[PDB]
Amino acid sequence: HHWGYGKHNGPEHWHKDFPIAKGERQSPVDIDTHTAKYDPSLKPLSVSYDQATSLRILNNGCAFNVEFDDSQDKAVLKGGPLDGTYRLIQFHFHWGSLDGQGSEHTVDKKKYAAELHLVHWNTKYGDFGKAVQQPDGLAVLGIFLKVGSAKPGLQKVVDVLDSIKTKGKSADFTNFDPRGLLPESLDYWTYPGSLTTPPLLECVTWIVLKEPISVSSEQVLKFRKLNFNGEGEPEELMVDNWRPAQPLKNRQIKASF
Ligand SMILES: C#Cc1cccc(S(N)(=O)=O)c1
Numbered sequence: 001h002h003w004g005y006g007k008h009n010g011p012e013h014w015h016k017d018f019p020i021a022k023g024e025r026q027s028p029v030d031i032d033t034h035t036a037k038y039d040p041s042l043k044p045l046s047v048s049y050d051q052a053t054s055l056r057i058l059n060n061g062c063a064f065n066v067e068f069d070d071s072q073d074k075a076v077l078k079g080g081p082l083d084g085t086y087r088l089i090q091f092h093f094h095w096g097s098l099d100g101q102g103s104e105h106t107v108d109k110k111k112y113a114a115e116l117h118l119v120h121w122n123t124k125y126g127d128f129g130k131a132v133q134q135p136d137g138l139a140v141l142g143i144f145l146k147v148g149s150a151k152p153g154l155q156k157v158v159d160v161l162d163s164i165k166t167k168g169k170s171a172d173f174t175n176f177d178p179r180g181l182l183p184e185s186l187d188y189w190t191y192p193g194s195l196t197t198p199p200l201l202e203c204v205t206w207i208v209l210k211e212p213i214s215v216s217s218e219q220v221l222k223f224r225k226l227n228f229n230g231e232g233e234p235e236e237l238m239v240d241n242w243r244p245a246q247p248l249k250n251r252q253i254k255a256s257f
């Protein structure tokens with residue numbers, strides 16, 4: 001694809017091919033904690049990952065995706081702002097070149113070192129491709145990463161990155177348990193938004209956890225050793241693959257707490 005994160009094809013250019021980039025419910029956004037309002041209408045959030053079936057990890061040229069078997073209800077998200085059942089299809093991260101940037105969402109303008117997106121689609125629509133054409137087709141659980149102590153449940157991800165250094169490479173990634181990437185608390189913020197890469201479709205219910213997970217410097221350092229380029233091409237480190245905050249427009253961010 002033509003789009004990327006560089007000066008000539010980055011976020012400020014995406015609107016030429018994807019005019020929805022200037023739409024009414026774009027993501028990410030800044031979460032102003034002083035104007036977000038507690039909502040008693042929100043039901044308990046249910047993250048049910050016990051039967052998750054991971055398959056593969058892929059360097060897609062922009063991030064890496066850990067993919068799941070979504071052919072049945074094995075790992076699902078329900079409750080909170082959501083009606084019905086949303087199946088886990090993949091997760092990926094966004095991160096920076098330096099620890100002071102990398103996240104897509106910000107909190108009172110604070111950028112974290114990275115952001116984890118656990119992507120789920122609404123089973124009422126039958127497949128992911130149909131779900132992304134619907135306003136309520138996806139639910140993305142966003143989790144901030146800060147640099148501190150190592151996250152043990154991340155380490156299996158870090159150690160396979162060696163084998164998917166360049167665009168188009170993949171590796172077997174079975175028997176990975178995404179429960180190991182979650183913080184203690186499920187307190188969250190929620191708002192209606194979009195995919196944060198082209199095609200930027202306005203199909204996502206965002207659920208952003210308040211509590212970040214800690215990862216070590218060595219762990220995030222390994223993320224930054226990945227490449228955007230394919231094998232045998234000049235090296236471009238895979239860093240700063242985040243879209244900045246977009247205008248909130250006519251949206252309210254609701255707090256679960
Ligand atoms: C699948 C998936 C997928 C594709 C584009 C962006 C996103 S994101 N970054 O979670 O909004 C997820």
Ligand SMILES: [N-]=[N+]=NCC(=O)NCCS
Pocket residue numbers: 001059060061167168169
């Ligand atoms: N695999 N690798 N990345 C290929 C890429 O260009 N995908 C774009 C969707 S057509």
Ligand SMILES: [N-]=[N+]=NCC(=O)NCCS
Pocket residue numbers: 003004005006009061062063228229230233236
């Ligand atoms: N080589 N490679 N880099 C070109 C490009 O910008 N890739 C898309 C990253 S999302």
Ligand SMILES: [Zn+2]
Pocket residue numbers: 092093094117196
């Ligand atoms: Zn993402």
